[PDB]
Amino acid sequence: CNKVRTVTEIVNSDEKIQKTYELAEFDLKNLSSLESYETLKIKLALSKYMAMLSTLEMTQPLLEIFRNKADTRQIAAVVFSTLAFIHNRFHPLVTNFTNKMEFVVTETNDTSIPGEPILFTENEGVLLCSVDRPSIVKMLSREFDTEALVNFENDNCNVRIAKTFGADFSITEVEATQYLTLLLTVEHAYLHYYIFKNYGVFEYCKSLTDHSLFTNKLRSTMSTKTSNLLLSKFKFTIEDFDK
């Protein structure tokens, strides 16, 4: 029941005193201390990535870049740098790899693909990759976002009430929020890319039909450091499927 008890006793049994406490609320403080600096770390990482992007002669906002289609150069460079960042974050060690890599833009629906907006052709003689600029532009059409929101909480007196009592390019945040989109997208691509680069093609018959059990292969594969699944309860209604 964890109703910790405690005693003091003088030499020669001259006196004995008792008191008691509980480990409760200590756990709450521990949880707060964890989540705080964890969020801090993640935010810091994001900031670093954005600052790295900032070097790249941003005569324009991001949105403009993809809203244009005439260029490919800037897009390719952005994609590449994203891949690099992910790889390094998995490998705390500088890398340059197979020094021949190229991109092609799937500029039309007839070249489009379900789901995965990115496709590595691992070696058609050499690696190539695909980019759906039209879709990417759809995603960045954004305006889904407004921060004025509300969020799940429960049992606050026990669970949360304690949490009640603690505390030029001068661009705004919404754009940065948007970056997370491509962060996640390139991550999801990196999964498949890494897998196939480490293994055969045929497992694409599974993974690309359904990624699914690929985590089983990833067992013992992850470097003992997590990526970008903090709010682990990502889910939607399911039983409604009415198959």
């Binding site: 405690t6 006196e15 005193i17 403080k29 521990n30 201390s33």
Partner: protein, 87 residues
């Protein structure tokens, strides 16, 4: 490090003996054990807090098993010790 002014090798004794002797006396009534209890509690509680602050493990066993552990008398006799035959 700069937070030090070493070489002050004073060995004070400052024996204002007769004044100090009486100065002691008004503290006599205070119940020793009852006071010490507070200090022990505070020490334990603060020490506890920091493990949770840093998400640590803890050895509830080892703490008691090591600190303020209790010996026992085994001699049947006496030995001399410090005292002042005051005045």
């Amino acid at each position: 490090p700069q937070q030090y002014i070493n070489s002050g090798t004073e060995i004070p004794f400052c024996d204002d003996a007769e004044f100090l002797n009486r100065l002691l006396k008004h503290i006599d009534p205070y119940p020793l054990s009852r006071m010490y209890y507070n200090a022990a509690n505070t020490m334990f509680y603060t020490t506890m807090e920091n493990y949770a602050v840093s998400n640590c493990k803890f050895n509830i066993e080892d703490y008691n098993n090591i600190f303020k552990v209790m010996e026992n008398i085994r001699k049947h006799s006496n030995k001399n010790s410090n005292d002042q035959d005051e005045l």
